[PDB]
Amino acid sequence: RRRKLPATIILRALNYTTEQILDLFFEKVIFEIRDNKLQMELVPERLRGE
Amino acid sequence: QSQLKLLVTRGKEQGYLTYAEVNDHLPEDIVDSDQIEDIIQMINDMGIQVMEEAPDADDTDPVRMYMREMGTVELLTREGEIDIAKRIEDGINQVQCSVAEYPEAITYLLEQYDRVEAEIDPELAREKFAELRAQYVVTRDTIKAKGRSHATAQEEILKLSEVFKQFRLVPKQFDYLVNSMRVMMDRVRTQERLIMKLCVEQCKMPKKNFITLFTGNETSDTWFNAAIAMNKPWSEKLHDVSEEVHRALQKLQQIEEETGLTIEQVKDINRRMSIGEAKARRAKKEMVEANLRLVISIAKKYTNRGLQFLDLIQEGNIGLMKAVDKFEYRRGYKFSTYATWWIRQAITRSIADQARTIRIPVHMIETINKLNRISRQMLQEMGREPTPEELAERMLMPEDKIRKVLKIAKEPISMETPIGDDEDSHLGDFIEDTTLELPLDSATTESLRAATHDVLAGLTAREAKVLRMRFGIDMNTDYTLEEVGKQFDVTRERIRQIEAKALRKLRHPSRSEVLRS
């Protein structure tokens, strides 16, 4: 019960890099750059309410 | 920006004055008991305008701020310490030598020695002081004789200085001498500044001319009458101060006769003495500034014992300040431990007295601590609580002395201590006053005065006055049978007879009877 701090500082205190932190809460989306264009790993279920 | 916009926009007006909110939206080190009052003072009371007086004012700790300036290390090594100590000894040497140059210090020591002998080996004192007196009386003759124009005579003078440097004087003696010389110099510069203030300002004489003229003899009127006969515009004003300047010169010449020294050189020796003082003082200050760490380091163990941290480390600083004074570089022993002892002694001789509100002697504190250290075993080396009788048996003291010892322990308790936890209780509020008398008692006392004043009315003058004067009432000072027997002719027994007869009269009235109880 003290002053507020970003809840990602304790994660770093547990030896977690920013890249590791991002791969613990959110689902990743991979893009590929082939044939001089932009592709995307499309997931239909994720397209709900957009 | 951040603090201002957040505070203003959020607090509109936070309804129930939600304190536990913006206090976390503030930078710097938190959990302080300082910034708390600066928020509960702005929110309400002088609303609206107060929220504009807050930002304009917004546009910490003793020990932490002490470690701050202490951060300046400037630590030393054996070479450093020896170096600083060397400068100290050099400064002290120059001062003592400057004192040796002063002949009146020697003759005063001679005079005070004759005072000592007129009422440490007595024969040894008669030995060294005889050497000093011998070298003095042999040097004194080589002065007015002028043989060896202060060439070989100066050798005997400096040899006398060496003889004087052989004496190890007490701090009070040296300080008295040095202070005396500075007071003498104070009178010298008093006369000099007098002449300057009178001639330069009052007579409109430029400072250039005064420095060009006065700097010469400074005593004889040869410079003054030459300044008047210079026929300058500021020379005619000197006539209105001739007596003053003359008085100053005559007094300065008197000083020449007092010190028996050349007035054009006393400034030199006094100057060099000041140089030595400043050097030694400076060096010693560097020493105490250097070993600052040791104080706080060892004072940490003495913490929490009726005296805060700052007081402890302060007594340690003065303890270190005392250790540096009595120490020489020409010693195999280092300063790190020698100073430590002085520091421990300094703080331990402080916690002993200036700790509790009530006085206490060192032996008492030692006996108390010893009792505790002994008592902590009796309940652990057996299994039951340490009985006072058996506890006293394991000591040199009987038992009742220990009982009286425990009646001195503790601060003790303060009145501002909560007890019943009402709304709200205070120990000092249950303490009744006893020095005051009951209004009933006071009323009975007044009625008693009136009663007695009315009872002595039913008596005779040579009986009322008798009872009144004997037991002393309404006349302050009470007298005896003799002092009343003389003022009434018949002495002693007779005046006692009537005194008894009056008592016989009071065996029927009930006033004083019931007043007795």
Shared-domain flag, residues B234 and B342: yes
CB pairs under 8 A between A and B: 10
Q: Give residues 25 to 84 of B whose Cβ lies within 8 Å of A.
A: 25-26, 30-31
Shared-domain flag, residues B52 and B132: no
Per the CB < 8 A criterion, the answer to whether B161 and B97 are in contact is: yes
What distance, in Å, lies between the first and last C-alpha atoms of chain B? 84
Are B31 and A2 a contacting pair at CB < 8 A?
A: yes
Shared-domain flag, residues B133 and B9: no
Are B30 and A2 a contacting pair at CB < 8 A?
A: yes
CB of B21 less than 8 A from some CB of A:
no
Shared-domain flag, residues B52 and B78: no
Shared-domain flag, residues B411 and B444: no
> What does each C-alpha distance from B294 to B166, B300, B322, B336, B341 come to in angstroms?
35, 10, 14, 8, 11
How far is A8 from chain B, CA to nearest CA, in Å? Answer: 17
Shared-domain flag, residues B201 and B303: yes
CB of A37 less than 8 A from some CB of B:
no
Shared-domain flag, residues B141 and B218: yes
Label each residue of B9-31 as H, E or C: HHCCCCCCCCCCCHHHCCCCCCC
What residue numbers bound the domain in which B22 lies? Answer: 1-59
Shared-domain flag, residues B348 and B207: yes
The domain that holds B103 is classified in CATH as: 1.10.601.10
Are B23 and A2 a contacting pair at CB < 8 A?
A: no
Number of structural domains in chain B: 4
Shared-domain flag, residues B277 and B198: yes
Final residue of a structural domain among B40, B59, B78? B59
The domain that holds B364 is classified in CATH as: 1.10.10.10
Alpha-carbon span B301 to B296, nearest angstrom? 9
The domain that holds B49 is classified in CATH as: 1.10.220.120
- Expressed in Å, this structure's resolution amounts to 3.9
Amino acid at B276: G
Final residue of a structural domain among B354, B382, B405? B354
> Would you list the DSSP string of B446-510?
HHHHHHHHHHGGGS-HHHHHHHHHHTT-SSSS---HHHHHTTTSS-THHHHHHHHHHHHH-SS-S
| Structure-token pair, residue B186 | 């104070």
| Structure-token pair, residue B282 | 């400076």
Shared-domain flag, residues B188 and B291: yes
Per the CB < 8 A criterion, the answer to whether B273 and B98 are in contact is: yes
Per the CB < 8 A criterion, the answer to whether B165 and B100 are in contact is: yes
Final residue of a structural domain among B410, B435, B460? B435
CB of B24 less than 8 A from some CB of A:
yes
Shared-domain flag, residues B81 and B19: no
Residue A40 DSSP SS3: strand
Using a CB-CB cut-off of 8 Å, the residues of chain A touching B25 are 4
Identify the experimental approach.
X-ray
How far is B309 from chain A, CA to nearest CA, in Å? Answer: 27
Shared-domain flag, residues B44 and B66: no
